[PDB]
Design a binder for this molecule. Structure first.
Ligand SMILES: Cc1c(S(=O)(=O)O)oc2c1C(=O)C(=O)c1c-2ccc2c1CCCC2(C)C
Ligand SMILES: Cc1c(S(=O)(=O)O)oc2c1C(=O)C(=O)c1c-2ccc2c1CCCC2(C)C
Ligand SMILES: Cc1c(S(=O)(=O)O)oc2c1C(=O)C(=O)c1c-2ccc2c1CCCC2(C)C
Ligand SMILES: Cc1c(S(=O)(=O)O)oc2c1C(=O)C(=O)c1c-2ccc2c1CCCC2(C)C
Length: 215
């Protein structure tokens, strides 16, 4: 692997979105990983529809939370996900309005990174593209993150409560990090991004629930 990778610079990452009040982070995370694979396989970068996932992934819980794996499985079994333009995000759950004419990406299932294995996660990010990850984002320090490599001693690697997107990794002043796209708008964090400690004993559970769609 290279010592640093940043998909944002490669045109694999769409702009930062805002989930509003809805606990749909799993849907934004899933969509970001799908968007990365769509770019890698077809050369097109387009916004895909997290609202399609919130409304239609029937065993996830809409604005109450969900697994990215179930979202990828839905897209696979449904043979498609809509573009954002065809199924816009409204920040509340609605009945499923999936429309095949708005289909913008497909998926052949997904792969999970071995639990807790940050080296495998690094490999996946390097070889595959942006990877969906779940972290503990419940702390005050996370809400108020501004700059630097995020590290809070109280982060709980079993309290996976927020899904985000690993779009790269690198090192800042000697501190290894993951480059994480969040979905809380540009006014949170560093224009919507956070650098999270890497190789620091799986800080915040970064590598506990990582997955990527196959395309
Ligand atoms: C600034 C700002 C902040 S924030 O800076 O206060 O976090 O949150 C939002 C904004 C917007 O400009 C915005 O358009 C928006 C936001 C939050 C949810 C939404 C939208 C537009 C579509 C409907 C939904 C519900 C998806
Ligand atoms: C190819 C292809 C395309 S498409 O992208 O070429 O239009 O759409 C579908 C396929 C399938 O192979 C397929 O099995 C399928 C599709 C669409 C909906 C469904 C199924 C199988 C279960 C029932 C449901 C309604 C979930
Ligand atoms: C959708 C879909 C796609 S695909 O559309 O992503 O290509 O591939 C498969 C599915 C299934 O739903 C499925 O059950 C399945 C698939 C492929 C192999 C198999 C199975 C179940 C039994 C036998 C084995 C294990 C060989
Ligand atoms: C977040 C974040 C991170 S990082 O800390 O997450 O890696 O790096 C950047 C951002 C930005 O939001 C951003 O606008 C930016 C960044 C880096 C270089 C640039 C720009 C905007 C103008 C062009 C140049 C090349 C000067």
């Amino acid at each position: 692997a290279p010592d640093s990778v940043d998909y944002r610079k490669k045109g694999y990452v769409t702009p930062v979105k805002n989930q509003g009040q809805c606990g749909s982070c799993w849907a934004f995370s899933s969509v970001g990983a799908l968007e990365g694979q769509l770019k890698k396989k077809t050369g097109k970068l387009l916004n895909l529809a997290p609202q399609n996932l919130v409304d239609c992934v029937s065993e996830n819980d809409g604005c109450g939370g969900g697994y990215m794996t179930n979202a990828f499985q839905y897209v696979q079994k449904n043979r498609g996900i809509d573009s954002e333009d065809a199924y816009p995000y409204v920040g509340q759950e609605e009945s499923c309005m999936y429309n095949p004419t708005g289909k913008a990406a497909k998926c052949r299932g997904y792969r999970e990174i071995p639990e807790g294995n940050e080296k495998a996660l690094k490999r996946a990010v390097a070889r595959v593209g942006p990877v969906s990850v779940a972290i503990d984002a419940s702390l005050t320090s996370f809400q108020f993150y501004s700059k630097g490599v995020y590290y809070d001693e109280s982060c709980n690697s079993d309290n996976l409560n927020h899904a985000v997107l690993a779009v790269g990794y690198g090192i800042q002043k000697g501190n290894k990090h993951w480059i994480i796209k969040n979905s809380w708008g540009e006014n949170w964090g560093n224009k919507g991004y956070i650098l999270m400690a890497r190789n620091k004993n799986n800080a915040c559970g970064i590598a506990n629930l990582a997955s990527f769609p196959k395309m």
